[PDB]
Amino acid sequence: MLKLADLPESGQMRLFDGRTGNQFERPTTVGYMYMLKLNHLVDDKMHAR
């Protein structure tokens, strides 16, 4: 599927830094992961007396 979508078959490629703008020496893993948000908001946890 990856090689069909013109993406690296290993699923990894070298990213560019966001501040210095220099490529990382080794390639990292990037992809779209289904992230959740749980009902543990800090808005309901912050108390102070």
Next chain:
DNA sequence: CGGGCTTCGGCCAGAGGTCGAGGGTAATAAGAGAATTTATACCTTTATCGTCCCATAG
């Protein structure tokens, strides 16, 4: 052969992390009427304490 004497088995007590966070649920039916006490309400009587006139001591 009864008797101290050790040991064992059944029975009960106590103790089991902390700190959050949220939610919910928490408990009813004799009337009559007689009687006794108590808080209330008005009123009078005595003392009390605020109040000022007056003689006097310096």
